[PDB]
Design a protein around this ligand. Structure first.
Ligand code: 5JD
Ligand code: 5JD
Lengths: 168, 168
């Protein structure tokens, strides 16, 4: 009845640490694809929202090097996102009055967009994660934080001082 | 002594579900940046390795639509990666003898590269995740699997039948 010689091969059984990498990548892709569609009317990708958010934690005004230190992304990535946001009218760049240093500031459009995006974003993430309990969320953050603290220094050696986000 | 009016503002305190999104994104970026440097001698990015791996689970030979169904990535992404791998000599594309259907096959170079990459990749992930216990790994996979199962159908409605990876 069942056909022979069809069933899965050895490459479908993974070490648990490799399966964890597949699980992390699948959840990041799934939760971001659903969030990006709900934020479409504000024309915000996940990385434009993360840079908006970091600049709101910095009081709406910083420099490229301080913004890069606070976020996980690579500096060339941070710069490309900031350029796209400058073209969208979300960031104003001005020369520091320090030769070659740039200051980056959110426009009041960007701050009002962040107004709107944070409220939608909070509902989206709450509905997405309603199938895990408060306890499972707290433990997931703790485990992921352990992994981030072990692994970020393997390639970022004093170059990041990531924003110390809290929850209650 | 401590300066006044400097400490963090309200945007540094998040809802736990938003902090979980930041934690997922930070761990994915940290573990991938360290893995990509160790795999550099094989010229494999994370997505070229994931497509190599999926095609090894499919017996080294499939079609673009079957490969896309098995992996989380978007089809245009899968196609762009497959094109880059065709240029690297990792994938051979041949016309099905079905007008307009393409078959994609790994070259024996690609299979030998996967030989080497899986062994390095397993050590890299084992060393990276040595700071969490077996129990914390098992629970992390379970929680992430719950989140993936809740959230993938919000935007992928019968378009994926993801490879059912196991661990022991
Ligand atoms: O709101 C944020 C802030 C930083 C990051 Cl890395 C992310 Cl994913 C979302
Ligand atoms: O080895 C793999 C297979 C699929 C995915 Cl999505 C990943 Cl991240 C790694």
């Amino acid at each position: 009845l069942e056909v022979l010689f069809q069933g899965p091969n050895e490459f479908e059984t993974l070490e648990l640490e490799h399966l964890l990498w597949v699980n992390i990548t699948q959840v990041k892709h799934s939760i971001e694809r659903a969030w990006t569609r709900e934020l479409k009317s504000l024309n915000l990708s996940t990385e434009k929202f993360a840079i908006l958010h970091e600049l709101m934690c910095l009081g709406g005004e910083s420099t490229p090097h301080t913004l890069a230190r606070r976020i996980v992304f690579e500096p060339h990535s941070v710069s490309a996102i900031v350029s796209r946001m400058e073209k969208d009218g979300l960031i104003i760049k001005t020369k520091d009055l320090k030769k070659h240093m740039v200051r980056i500031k959110l426009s009041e459009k960007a701050i009002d967009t962040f107004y709107q995006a944070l409220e939608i974003s909070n509902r989206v993430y709450k509905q997405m994660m309603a199938s895990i309990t408060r306890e499972e969320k707290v433990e997931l953050s703790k485990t992921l934080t352990k992994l981030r603290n072990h692994t970020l220094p393997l390639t970022h050696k004093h170059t990041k001082t990531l924003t110390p986000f809290k929850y209650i």
